[PDB]
């Protein structure tokens, strides 16, 4: 049933990646999560399930085949550097700050009106 094929495939070695168009079929499924895809993709290239990253998967009308982009890295520690911050956030780690962006703006303009080390107490 569900299987990946990786129609196209190229190795770049710039980011130490193996770029490929990962195409996964779904005869009776609804775009299985990438967790199931990353596990089945690591055993295909004998890599680890922590270095493969896939994105851009939208199931076409009716269902049956979902195409997307995929890439593999060398290690998880090396993947922490060459990876967008939101793609690492989608995993169980890297919970970014979620306070606000407007509260930080008004804090910056308030601290801009105070000169010296007293601005740290004004914002707090």
């Amino acid at each position: 049933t569900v299987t990946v094929r990786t129609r196209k495939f190229m190795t770049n070695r710039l980011l130490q990646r193996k770029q490929m168009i990962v195409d996964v079929l779904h005869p009776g499924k609804a775009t299985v999560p990438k967790t199931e895809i990353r596990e089945k993709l690591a055993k295909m290239y004998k890599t680890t399930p922590d270095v493969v990253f896939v994105f851009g998967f939208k199931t076409q009308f009716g269902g049956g085949k979902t195409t997307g982009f995929g890439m593999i890295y060398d290690s998880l520690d090396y993947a922490k550097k060459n990876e967008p911050k939101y793609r690492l956030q989608r995993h169980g780690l890297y919970e970014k700050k979620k306070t606000s962006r407007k509260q930080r703006k008004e804090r910056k303009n308030r601290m801009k009106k105070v000169r010296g080390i007293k601005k740290a107490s004004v914002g707090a």
Binding site: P27, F61, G62, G63, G64
Partner: protein, 180 residues
């Protein structure tokens, strides 16, 4: 400065005479013959034909030894014979002017499924596609206004998930079964 398109064209043209007694029946006849929703679809296919006729008309005004007429003319012919509105033997721009509105109505998906017997009537052929049954090369189509090509004419069949094809039945079939 927005990352958008703002490119959109119309598909139909309202006729000049709103109550032309001779025109009202000629378009109404195409309604029931091919199972169309309203007169907008008649004017839509009439507008696509009017564009192809005018595109072929301006090419015929140029000299035959003009490379623009040779390239653009053949490209228009190959697309007409590709969808099946024109035969390979009559592959010339002079035959484009002889194409009628029903020539493009026959290539409609709701009519091709009627010629193949997959549907009972021409009006049921619309509902057959409207309920996501007919597929073309494992690609299911829902809108009835699809146009098939010759390399995809012999691939019109039921979907692998439709009750009329091979797969699970409908929700009404499972409803009467559990209650009985």
């Amino acid at each position: 400065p927005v990352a958008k398109t703002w490119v959109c064209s119309k598909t139909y043209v309202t006729p000049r005479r709103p109550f032309e007694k001779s025109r009202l029946d000629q378009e109404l006849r195409l309604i029931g013959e091919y199972g169309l929703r309203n007169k907008r679809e008649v004017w839509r296919v009439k507008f696509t034909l009017a564009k192809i006729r005018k595109a072929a008309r301006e090419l015929l005004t140029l000299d035959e030894k003009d490379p623009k007429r040779l390239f653009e003319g053949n490209a228009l012919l190959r697309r007409l014979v590709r969808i099946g509105v024109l035969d390979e033997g009559k592959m010339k721009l002079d035959y484009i002017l002889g194409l009628k509105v029903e020539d493009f109505l026959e290539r409609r998906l709701q009519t091709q499924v009627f010629k193949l017997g997959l549907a009972k009537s021409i009006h049921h052929a619309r509902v057959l596609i409207r309920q996501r049954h007919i597929r073309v090369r494992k690609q299911v189509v829902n809108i009835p206004s699809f146009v098939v090509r010759l390399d995809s004419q012999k691939h019109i069949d039921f979907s692998l998930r439709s009750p009329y094809g091979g797969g699970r039945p409908g929700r009404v079939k499972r409803k009467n079964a559990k209650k009985a």
